[PDB]
Design an enzyme around this catalytic site. Structure first.
Site, mmCIF file in Angstrom:
data_model
loop_
_atom_site.group_PDB
_atom_site.id
_atom_site.type_symbol
_atom_site.label_atom_id
_atom_site.label_comp_id
_atom_site.label_asym_id
_atom_site.label_seq_id
_atom_site.Cartn_x
_atom_site.Cartn_y
_atom_site.Cartn_z
ATOM 1 N N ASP A 37 0.815 -1.207 0.000
ATOM 2 C CA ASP A 37 0.000 0.000 0.000
ATOM 3 C C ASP A 37 0.853 1.264 0.000
ATOM 4 O O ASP A 37 1.430 1.664 1.044
ATOM 5 C CB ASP A 37 -0.990 -0.074 1.221
ATOM 6 C CG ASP A 37 -1.841 1.165 1.393
ATOM 7 O OD1 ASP A 37 -2.024 1.944 0.415
ATOM 8 O OD2 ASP A 37 -2.371 1.361 2.512
ATOM 9 N N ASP A 221 -1.415 5.584 -5.355
ATOM 10 C CA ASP A 221 -1.877 4.735 -4.202
ATOM 11 C C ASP A 221 -2.281 3.312 -4.593
ATOM 12 O O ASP A 221 -3.366 3.103 -5.125
ATOM 13 C CB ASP A 221 -3.020 5.458 -3.470
ATOM 14 C CG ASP A 221 -3.546 4.662 -2.320
ATOM 15 O OD1 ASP A 221 -2.897 3.625 -2.005
ATOM 16 O OD2 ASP A 221 -4.593 5.054 -1.744
HETATM 17 C C1 LIG Z 1 -4.980 1.734 4.888
HETATM 18 C C2 LIG Z 1 -5.732 1.838 3.560
HETATM 19 C C3 LIG Z 1 -6.513 0.601 3.220
HETATM 20 C C4 LIG Z 1 -6.451 0.061 1.969
HETATM 21 C C5 LIG Z 1 -7.191 -1.110 1.688
HETATM 22 N N1 LIG Z 1 -7.093 -1.593 0.389
HETATM 23 C C6 LIG Z 1 -7.760 -2.607 -0.184
HETATM 24 O O1 LIG Z 1 -8.570 -3.282 0.426
HETATM 25 C C7 LIG Z 1 -7.532 -2.789 -1.621
HETATM 26 C C8 LIG Z 1 -8.501 -3.482 -2.380
HETATM 27 C C9 LIG Z 1 -8.250 -3.532 -3.758
HETATM 28 C C10 LIG Z 1 -7.078 -2.919 -4.312
HETATM 29 C C11 LIG Z 1 -6.798 -3.003 -5.726
HETATM 30 N N2 LIG Z 1 -6.566 -3.066 -6.853
HETATM 31 C C12 LIG Z 1 -6.185 -2.258 -3.473
HETATM 32 N N3 LIG Z 1 -6.473 -2.190 -2.192
HETATM 33 C C13 LIG Z 1 -8.069 -1.711 2.612
HETATM 34 C C14 LIG Z 1 -8.132 -1.154 3.880
HETATM 35 C C15 LIG Z 1 -7.327 -0.032 4.168
HETATM 36 F F1 LIG Z 1 -7.436 0.504 5.385
HETATM 37 N N4 LIG Z 1 -4.776 2.187 2.504
HETATM 38 C C16 LIG Z 1 -5.117 3.073 1.602
HETATM 39 N N5 LIG Z 1 -4.306 3.469 0.588
HETATM 40 O O2 LIG Z 1 -6.279 3.672 1.523
HETATM 41 C C17 LIG Z 1 -7.364 3.311 2.393
HETATM 42 C C18 LIG Z 1 -8.224 4.583 2.560
HETATM 43 F F2 LIG Z 1 -7.503 5.698 2.930
HETATM 44 F F3 LIG Z 1 -8.925 4.785 1.382
HETATM 45 F F4 LIG Z 1 -9.103 4.416 3.566
HETATM 46 C C19 LIG Z 1 -6.756 2.967 3.748
HETATM 47 F F5 LIG Z 1 -6.115 4.117 4.208
#
Ligand SMILES: C[C@]1(c2cc(NC(=O)c3ccc(C#N)cn3)ccc2F)N=C(N)O[C@H](C(F)(F)F)[C@@H]1F
Ligand code: NA
Ligand code: NA
EC number: 3.4.23.46
Length: 368
Positions: A37, A221
């Protein structure tokens, strides 16, 4: 430098669930699948038997775990996690041959965080200390890797849209991309914030104050699926894409990601989206171009519109990244893009990264 055979293909995923890498924590090593992430900064792993999880960090089994005697509470728009801070030894079995002492948040309580049916149990936040929780004194995994080893301060991502790809820690692998890499400045080391200076839909400009593209920030991201666009730009973008394709008609809910849409076994009507990003040199930019293939996601012949509105600025999620090899060049504060050797395409058009373009007043496009 240049060739990292042992790290190629070290990511897996399921469509819709993100990309993860195998890691080990503690002694003896505990194997966990961890979501890659670039839009967060905590290494946070499930540490209690939540029913969605295939496994979790059992601190009690680790001879090298040190308690920091400090809790963290982390809410998001959707859901939250709480956990306990500590440090332990971490490796990446299909990454560099090194072990580092890193901060880990052992997640002891969560809501709407873990995905039911997914194969990962924590998150590797790859962005900077400034957005770490609780505060910027909790050094992120990548900063620990760099402080404690000779691994260079950069990593690169090839996300192949089930899913796979490569995280190259410490370098770039030339087999992962074609043509040239072009670089945009990381504007502030918090998120991987960048500056979008022009947007075109099938080579027509949205013609907005470029400050709107970056209101209040734009970021790269891999922990988000969608291309997310500020509300005002999003309004303009769909208005222009609707028009671009109105050879076919779609229910309006579709454009809001409120209903899906289906065919059998139609792409050429859907337009390309070009983002021009601030370049490395004054008055110079370059452009990346994505295909309907990136912005129409398969759900299982039914797709979701994967561009959505935002109130946190532009987010170049997995939708954008799956077209590109993306080099997170922290030593030089810049992100490089090149055409991915694995991107989903067709016989007519390819994703593209082209420059240089002359764009004036690029510093005006930053929101303050
Ligand atoms: C920490 C966090 C997060 C990501 C995901 N991501 C996924 O579940 C996911 C699912 C599918 C894909 C693909 N392709 C990528 N990621 C799930 C929970 C979460 F807390 N990381 C980011 N950047 O944004 C989220 C936010 F800030 F939006 F809350 C949140 F911070
Ligand atoms: Na070092
Ligand atoms: Na190459």
């Amino acid at each position: 430098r240049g060739s990292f055979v042992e790290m190629v293909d070290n990511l897996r995923g399921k469509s819709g669930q993100g990309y993860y890498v195998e890691m080990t924590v503690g002694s003896p090593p505990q194997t966990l699948n961890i979501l890659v992430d670039t839009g967060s900064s905590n290494f946070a792993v499930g540490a209690a038997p939540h029913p969605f999880l295939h496994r979790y960090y059992q601190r009690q089994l680790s001879s090298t775990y040190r308690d920091l005697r400090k809790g963290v509470y982390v809410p998001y728009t959707q859901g939250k996690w709480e956990g306990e801070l500590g440090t332990d030894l971490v490796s990446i079995p299909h990454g560099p041959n090194v072990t580092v002492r890193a901060n880990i948040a052992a997640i002891t309580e969560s809501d709407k965080f873990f995905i039911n049916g997914s194969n990962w149990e924590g998150i590797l936040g790859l962005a900077y200390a400034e957005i770490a929780r609780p505060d910027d004194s909790l050094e992120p995994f990548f900063d620990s890797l760099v402080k404690q080893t000779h691994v260079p301060n950069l990593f690169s991502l090839q996300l192949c849209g089930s899913v796979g790809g490569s995280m190259i820690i410490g370098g770039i692998d030339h087999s992962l991309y074609t043509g040239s890499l072009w670089y945009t400045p990381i504007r502030r080391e918090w998120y991987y914030e960048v500056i979008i200076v022009r947007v075109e839909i099938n080579g027509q400009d949205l013609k907005m104050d470029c400050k709107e593209y970056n209101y209040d920030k734009s970021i790269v991201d891999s922990g988000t699926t969608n291309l997310r666009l500020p509300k005002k730009v999003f309004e303009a973008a769909v208005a222009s894409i609707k028009a671009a394709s109105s050879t076919e008609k779609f229910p309006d809910g579709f454009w809001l990601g409120e209903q899906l849409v289906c065919w059998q076994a139609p792409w050429n009507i859907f337009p390309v989206i070009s983002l021009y990003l601030m370049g490395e040199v004054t008055n110079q930019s370059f452009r990346i171009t994505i295909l309907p293939q990136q912005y129409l996601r398969p759900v299982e012949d039914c797709y979701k519109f994967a561009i959505s509105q935002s109130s946190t600025g532009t987010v170049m999620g997995a939708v954008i990244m799956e077209g590109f090899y993306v080099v997170f060049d922290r030593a030089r504060k810049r992100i490089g893009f090149a055409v991915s050797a694995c991107h989903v395409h067709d016989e007519f058009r390819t994703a593209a990264v082209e420059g240089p373009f002359v764009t004036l007043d690029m510093e005006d496009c930053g929101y303050n």
